[PDB]
């Protein structure tokens, strides 16, 4: 099983190239503003906390 749900905080970015985007464009964008909630909020784990 290659295509599956792995590593997820909570939100589910509507887009796909959220990272690639945020990476540069940054969530600041309007496309990856909310639709890229994950990339925005979600990341991996307790980064700051």
Curated annotation (Swiss-Prot):
Disulfide bonds join 9-42, 18-36, 27-40. Testis and epididymis. It is found in: Secreted. Residues 9-42 form the ShKT domain. Interacts with NSUN4 isoform 3. Belongs to the CRISP family. May regulate some ion channels' activity and thereby regulate calcium fluxes during sperm capacitation. This is Cysteine-rich secretory protein 2. The gene is CRISP2. The chain holds residues 204 to 239 of 243 of the full protein.
């Amino acid at each position: 099983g290659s295509s599956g749900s792995s590593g997820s905080c909570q939100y589910q970015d509507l887009l796909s190239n959220c990272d690639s985007l945020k990476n540069t464009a940054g969530c600041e964008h309007e496309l990856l503003k909310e639709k890229c909630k994950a990339t925005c909020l979600c990341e991996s784990g307790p980064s700051s906390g």
